[PDB]
Amino acid sequence: SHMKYHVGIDVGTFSVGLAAIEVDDAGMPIKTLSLVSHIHDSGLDPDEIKSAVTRLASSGIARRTRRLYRRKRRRLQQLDKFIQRQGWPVIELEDYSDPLYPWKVRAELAASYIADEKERGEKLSVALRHIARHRGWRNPYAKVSSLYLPDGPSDAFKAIREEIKRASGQPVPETATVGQMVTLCEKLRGEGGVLSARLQQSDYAREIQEICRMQEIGQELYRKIIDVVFAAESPKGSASSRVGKDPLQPGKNRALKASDAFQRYRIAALIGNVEEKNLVFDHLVNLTPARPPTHDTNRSIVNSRIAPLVDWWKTASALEQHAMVKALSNAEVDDFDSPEGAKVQAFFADLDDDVHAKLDSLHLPVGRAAYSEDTLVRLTRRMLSDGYTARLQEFGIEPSWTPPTPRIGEPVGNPAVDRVLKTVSRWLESATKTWGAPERVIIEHSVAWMANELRSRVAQHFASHGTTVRVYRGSLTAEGKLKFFDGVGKSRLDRRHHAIDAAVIAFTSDYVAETLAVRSDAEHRAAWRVWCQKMEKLSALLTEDLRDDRVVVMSNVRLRLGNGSAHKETIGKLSKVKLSSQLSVSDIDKASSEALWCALTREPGFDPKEGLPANPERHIRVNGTHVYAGDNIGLFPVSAGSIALRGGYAELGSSFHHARVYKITSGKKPAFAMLRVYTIDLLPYRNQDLFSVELKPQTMSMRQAEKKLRDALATGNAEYLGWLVVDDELVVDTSKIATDQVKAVEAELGTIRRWRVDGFFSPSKLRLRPLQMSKEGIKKESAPELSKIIDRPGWLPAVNKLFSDGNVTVVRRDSLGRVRLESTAHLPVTWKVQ
RNA sequence: GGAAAUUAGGUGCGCUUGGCACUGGGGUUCAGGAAACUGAACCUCAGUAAGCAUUGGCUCGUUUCCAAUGUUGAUUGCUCCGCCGGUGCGCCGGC
DNA sequence: GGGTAATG
DNA sequence: CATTACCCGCCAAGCGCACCTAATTTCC
Ligand SMILES: [Zn+2]
């Protein structure tokens, strides 16, 4: 389009004010193109009760924990295979009748020799498998070899040792293993017994060591046992995948600190910051001996006084010892592929058991450089042959060069920031592809990192079209006569003020920018006269849009199947009932599986009202498994939707993906019901349209549904009209269906016809809140009805009452806030409930 | 304003571990009982999202079974389908 | 904050 | 139908990648 306009962007803590106003050729506002107060969830996990935990954070904890249980099972499987290769038997502890049998064996093995070769191996296998389960803690980067010569007893070991001395009275504070202290007590696990059990793997390795001495087990096998019992993956190269990149040379990973490159680079940087001959002379001394810098890694390596290491350092080539640096640093992956690293790795086998612990005491510098190894070396070479100035000539980079920025929507790692970045990119792209590029983009308001990154990302994005981009401080930003919901001029309750503040921001001249912050030069005064002429012209446009309610308050919706944890974490005991018992319809709907529900509901004696009568001769098949009248079956003890899990059960919670809306034509009068679809009932149909997935009556979603809707679906009197999702926008006529507290809100604040879907409260009730309002605007002098409707729990209308007499329309919008009535791309579309 | 090296500090995540809690199997010892039995402490093993993918099986399941291995399973808010746009069939983005 | 279970 | 009480699993460890803030020397 040939229209010229300005763009104002207001960044809030949980909102984004987006504004674009058509501007005259001189600078006067003409028409408002798009006013949007975009609200976001800050990327937070809804199931974390507002402890400021994002989905990314909780996903990672679940991801790592899920792997932890897998890694723990692999260890115990490998230990059993290691025990069987030694001719020892893998005996289960439930075979022995003594519940404390593993503790007795661990104390017996650490005291005297065991005669029988069979009994000695059977009890060693019992003691080893037990220590592996509760094996204490070690530094994750410390390798197994750090335990071949275990360290002295930990502070926790000494603390527990004195604890038994007090409770038992008879102490042995000398050469006592963990097993033989505990054995004489005859409540360990928990807060009370092991006093939080802040133990160490070295303490358990010491117990294993003494067991090996008593059973005539040399170091050749003790070491091999320590390898298996204390096996663990290392977090060595865990950070190697998320390393930044060189701006000058994109494809190369950033240089690693404590490398011969960076160290020889670093001191070259300081001398340059003249004597164009004596540069290299000074550098020679600085290389090989605020304070001056040095080749810190080489100094740290030699001083270590590790006799076997120092011999390798001089004999190894510069490239060979470069691999030694990567292997010792906690940020690099050991390779075993190149010959160099294979030599370093081969050296890592022959060292004595006393050498290993000395390696962990050594500390190399940690960090990353801005450029990359090849660029690090190349500039020192060019630095040597010269006296920034040294850096310029290497790349043919025009001196004004700054490292480029990614696309606007490129995520940065912070979930709250990535919400804004992706939103601003989407809106500008929709704005650009409609009215072309803008003339000015002005951005306003820890969170300032967003605003800075926006300007940089936006400026490069619009560099071709010559668009000015500016940021301003929040205090300078704030420095009218508009009518909002709660007050005049200013408002914290009305969410439309975010777009209004963004509109004013699109018209802040830089000469006005000085005086605005100043108020909290002759030409500066000429600007103010032009400015007020624009502002007074702008004020009229927003009043109309505020009156016509053209300011759009909106948020995105989440339609994918995955949405946090799929059920509650607490597990409860199931209810077991003999099959011959009397089973009402309520009892059958509490069955722990769908197959059980089908077997019970397909019985001949089943009645849709009375259920199943007591019958000592009823026969039931569940997944080919026959169940007699004398067998127990599992039922949920609660009416809540749940799943059988880990022997017991767990409640599904608020894990609704979407809710479907039905019209029930029963002949009496058309009624409206609602089906809340659980996330779990859409798992087998992940690859389909979730809103068209045929849910079967056996699914929990169906059984938890309003009974009226269930009978209608079984007869064909329920018409699927559409689906709702959390953060969907509704238009509601509250004249006939508003509750008393809603009307009290509406009387004080005006009729509220735009509502937002915040939850699916009951199988028959919605959770709605006013779309354009925020809780922070509720003052102490306000009415208590506002806190009920806006804060908690909100308007909770019945689905049938709301849709029958509310004249409700579900409103979906595009990125510019415009109502979307039809879509070629099969995107969510506005529809009317009728 | 910005960039490099620095000293001080913060935020956000990444990786591997350590303890519990919960449910299930087992076991011992108690409390109360005349007993049958309850119930409580402990100890031990196991599960620790639901699932999805591959392989191989069964009684081959619209009551969707079993076993092994892997898992990015839960960031990226318009699922799926479709059309473009980048990217290393898939990922990201736009409608 | 969400929902369930339980009252008006 | 509307309204209200009450329910939700937690705590450590060492390290490293990213980014930001406040200062000093150069240089753009
Ligand atoms: Zn049968």
Residue numbers in the entry: -1 to 184, 189 to 275, 289 to 304, 339 to 436, 440 to 497, 667 to 700, 709 to 749, 771 to 1084
Question: Any passages from the paper?
Answer:
The crystal structure revealed that CdCas9 adopts a bilobed architecture consisting of the REC and NUC lobes, with the guide RNA-target DNA heteroduplex bound within the central channel, as in the other Cas9 structures. In the present structure, the PAM duplex is bound between the WED and PI domains, where the GGGTAAT PAM is recognized by multiple residues in the PI domain. Unexpectedly, the O6 and N7 of dG2* form bidentate hydrogen bonds with Arg1042, despite the lack of an observed preference for the second PAM nucleotide. The N7 of dG3* forms a hydrogen bond with Arg1017, and the R1017A mutant showed almost no activity, confirming the importance of Arg1017 for the PAM recognition.
Besides the crRNA-target DNA complementarity, DNA recognition by Cas9 requires a protospacer adjacent motif (PAM), a specific DNA sequence located downstream of the target sequence.
